[PDB]
């Protein structure tokens, strides 16, 4: 009984570590979309400031 439960512990751990790897990817994928939005937003703001200052000077 003890030995068989140890084999069960190893298999259960295999599936848990697979789940954890997949879940991590989903978080990476979601964060990457937010990063692309932050990247694009930063560029537009700087251009407005450059154009705004040049429209005064």
């Amino acid at each position: 009984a003890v030995v068989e439960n140890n084999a069960c512990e190893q298999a259960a751990r295999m599936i848990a570590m697979k789940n954890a790897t997949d879940n991590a990817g989903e978080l990476i994928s979601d964060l990457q979309l937010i990063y692309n939005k932050a990247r694009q937003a930063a560029i537009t703001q700087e251009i407005s400031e450059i154009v705004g200052g040049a429209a005064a000077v």
Binding site: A20, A24, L27, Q45, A55, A56
Partner: protein
């Protein structure tokens, strides 16, 4: 005297007058062949003034004659406005004939002085568990409902109109600033059929309207409310969306020759808000309890308009799209929402401790989110698992079916007293309800209903 239209660009018009007859700032002008009204914003020199049209500019041309009226936009005030619908210029728009006005007041005024201010700490029970718990309101104070598109601002306002008209016996003033025309029709007929209409003054300037209307409708509503406050009366001033007053100002700012500020906003953003917000206060003569909905652009609470509005309010209710995505209604964020009345000297220690305890529990649950996201709840410590369980029950017990939402869902509305609200959350925090399933707390009003919901 009479001036000539010299320039037209969208909603903004320049008019030239004789050097001895130049109109003052905010003076109202009328175009001779169409009777379109213009409001003077600034004097440019050489007898030329710049103005915003209080209507459509399509069909206007250069060289038309313009008449100066000698005064600012003046609107009817007093008892004659109750049960009537008016536009930005004070004209009736309900087909019920002329208004029986006794006097008219200009829409531009100075805020009440520091020595005419009044302190209101009398709690105003709303009947909503989350507001009565973490955002207690006060009579004569200001409330703001912050939220993105489609999250609960109009529904959470209509419920507070129903549950505050239970104890209030005075008059109300409603100002519709840049919102849906259908929602103004729905609200008018609801009050007319319910016989509530004879105690409410209605003003509208919806999304269909040009920029000048949307920019001044807020002042026209407030001016009628001030008349009632200064007669020594208790009034309720409701503003459908205060952000549209600021936005109408952004559409016109570049046409007024102003350099833009951060993210394209007008350089005058904080002054325009304060000049309108300061007048909405309870003086010593009377009180103006005010509720204003605040739209949040692209769900960004750091945007200049929402960011500048928080300092003008006594209670801040922050709605969230994430809470709404889980099914909870009202979707109030207990960690972002707050009130000046949440003080031991105002509400008592028991209520203040129940709220502090609910917030402490939710804050820790928010911090554990990432670990549970990758490894699940089973790796947490024994105490952490217990908190995560109470945090989840508290989350669903903050949900409540409203009487203005039974049409959407079909379930009946619930009114919960401040006493029942405290008892339910105090019990869940103490652990008296640790044997009920989480789903016994969702949309159950009082805690006894959760006990009876758990029987199924």
């Amino acid at each position: 005297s009479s001036g000539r239209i010299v320039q037209i660009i969208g909603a903004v018009i320049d008019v030239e007058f004789p050097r001895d007859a130049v109109p003052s700032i905010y003076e109202a002008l009328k175009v001779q062949g169409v009777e379109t009204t213009l409001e003077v914003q600034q004097q440019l020199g050489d007898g030329v003034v710049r103005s915003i049209a209080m209507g459509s500019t399509e069909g206007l041309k250069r060289g038309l004659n313009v008449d100066s009226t000698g005064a600012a936009i003046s609107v009817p005030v007093g008892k004659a406005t109750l049960g009537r619908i008016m536009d930005v210029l004070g004209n009736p728009i309900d087909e019920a004939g002329p208004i029986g006005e006794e006097e008219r007041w200009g829409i531009h005024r100075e805020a009440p002085s520091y020595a005419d201010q009044a302190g209101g700490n009398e709690l105003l029970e709303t009947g909503i568990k989350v507001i009565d718990l973490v955002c207690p309101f006060a009579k004569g104070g200001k409330v703001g409902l912050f939220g993105g598109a489609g999250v609960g601002k109009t529904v959470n306002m209509m419920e507070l109109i129903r549950n505050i008209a239970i104890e209030h016996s005075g008059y109300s003033v409603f100002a519709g600033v840049g919102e849906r025309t259908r929602e103004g029709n729905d609200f008018y007929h609801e009050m007319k059929d319910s016989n509530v209409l004879d105690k409410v003054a209605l003003v509208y300037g919806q999304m269909n309207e040009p920029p000048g209307n949307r920019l001044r409708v807020a002042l026209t509503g407030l001016t009628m409310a001030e008349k009632f406050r200064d007669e020594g009366r208790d009034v309720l001033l409701f503003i459908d969306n205060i952000y549209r007053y600021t936005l109408a100002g952004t559409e016109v700012s570049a046409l007024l020759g102003r350099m833009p500020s951060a993210v394209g906003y007008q350089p005058t953003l904080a002054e325009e808000m304060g000049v309108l917000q300061e007048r909405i206060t309870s003086t010593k003569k009377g009180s103006i309890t005010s509720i204003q909905a605040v739209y949040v652009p692209a769900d960004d609470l750091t945007d200049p308009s929402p960011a500048t509005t928080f300092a003008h309010l006594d209670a801040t209710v922050v709605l969230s799209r994430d809470i709404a995505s889980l099914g909870i209604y009202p979707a109030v964020d207990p960690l972002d929402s707050t009130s000046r009345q949440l003080d031991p000297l105002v509400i008592g220690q028991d209520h203040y401790d129940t709220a502090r305890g609910v917030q402490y529990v939710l804050q820790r649950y928010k911090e554990l989110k990432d670990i549970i996201a990758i490894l699940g709840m089973d790796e947490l410590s024994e105490a952490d698992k217990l908190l995560v369980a109470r945090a989840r029950k508290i989350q669903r017990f903050l949900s409540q079916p409203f009487f203005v939402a039974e049409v959407f869902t079909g379930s009946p509305g619930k009114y919960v007293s401040l006493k029942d609200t405290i008892a339910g959350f105090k019990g869940i925090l103490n652990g008296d309800y640790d044997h009920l399933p989480e789903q016994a707390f969702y949309m159950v009003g009082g805690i006894e209903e959760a006990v009876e919901k758990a029987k199924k």
